[PDB]
């Protein structure tokens, strides 16, 4: 019994009932959100969440978001039970690319490697592989998909250096880096002005925070989504 919203009333899924165990689940987890459409239902926990088509077909993933550092191999997960083809696509910044395909495998990116399993593998991750991965699955009567958002991350490298102080926060990704300047008691300093955003060929960003130096120690304390704790540098 899962609470759900049907497209524009409110209903529930066991009221509509059809027995699952004819077509096996990859797992069962029972705050969650749910939406039924004309029938296919999307189940969305904060962790993993399947896509279920009425049961006759379902598509399963154990995580809808994945934060992976660059270079690391991504075992993006996707699975289904019940086939014509399995395609993995990438959508990011308005650009739709093919990543992999299977019929009767064709890895568009050279290293792509794929109760059935479709857990595609991305070795040697690059910034250009960030985005929304759609594990489209085709079937003689269904074409259900599954969304995996692969947030590629890159830790910065802060090089505090020089009456102007400059810390080159290079190689970070994604863009939202917050730079806090601490002076020493380590009191924060206002008035730091960023430079123009720069990029490397790999897609990682380089930026520099400039702060005027007055007499005394300083610390370019850089926090980022890829960091458990805010790293930095001091001179």
């Amino acid at each position: 019994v899962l609470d759900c919203f049907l497209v524009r009333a409110r209903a529930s899924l066991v009221l509509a009932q059809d027995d699952p165990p004819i077509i096996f689940e990859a797992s069962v987890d029972l705050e969650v959100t749910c939406e039924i459409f004309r029938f296919m239902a999307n189940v969305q926990v904060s962790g993993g969440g399947p896509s279920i088509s009425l049961v006759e077909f379902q598509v399963m993933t154990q995580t809808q978001s994945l934060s992976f550092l660059l270079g690391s191999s991504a075992s993006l997960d996707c699975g289904f039970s019940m086939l014509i083809s399995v395609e993995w696509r990438l959508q990011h910044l308005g650009r739709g690319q093919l990543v992999y395909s299977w019929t009767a495998g064709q890895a568009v990116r050279k290293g792509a490697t794929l109760a059935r399993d479709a857990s595609l593998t991305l070795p040697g991750l690059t910034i250009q592989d960030e985005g929304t991965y759609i594990c489209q699955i085709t079937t003689s009567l269904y074409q259900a998909q599954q969304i995996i958002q692969l947030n590629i991350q890159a830790s910065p490298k802060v090089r505090l250096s020089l009456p102007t102080l400059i810390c080159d926060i290079a190689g970070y990704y994604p863009l939202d880096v917050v730079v806090t300047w601490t002076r020493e008691s380590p009191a924060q300093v206002s008035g730091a002005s960023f430079s123009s955003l720069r990029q490397s060929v790999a897609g990682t960003y380089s930026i520099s925070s400039s702060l005027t130096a007055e007499p005394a120690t300083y610390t370019c304390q850089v926090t980022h989504i890829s960091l458990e704790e805010p790293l930095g540098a001091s001179t």
Partner: protein, 98 residues
């Protein structure tokens, strides 16, 4: 999803002492379109500033080019304050000649 602006402050031509030029603040990549952009002359807002209206990139981002005629002085400096929603603190991007 909100995306941090990519802000560039530069000139139409390489800066020459006293030679007329235009200060471009190419603020791109930002989302949503609600954004406050000011061109700063020695820390204070320039009054006579023109700007191309909201432009729409393929990336689903918006970009704006605020320009103003200036003469690049050696003893005076320029910047570009940006106050997008993703910016918990308004970001002032320095104008280095390069």
């Amino acid at each position: 999803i909100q995306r941090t602006p990519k802000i560039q402050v530069y000139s139409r031509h390489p800066a020459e002492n006293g030679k007329s030029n235009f200060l471009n603040c190419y603020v791109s990549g930002f989302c949503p379109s609600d954004i406050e952009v000011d061109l700063l002359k020695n820390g204070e807002r320039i009054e006579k500033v023109e700007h191309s209206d909201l432009s729409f990139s393929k990336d689903w981002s918006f970009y704006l080019l605020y320009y103003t005629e200036f003469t690049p002085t050696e003893k005076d400096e320029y910047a570009c304050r940006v106050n997008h929603v993703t910016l918990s603190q308004p970001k002032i991007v320095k104008w280095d000649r390069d």
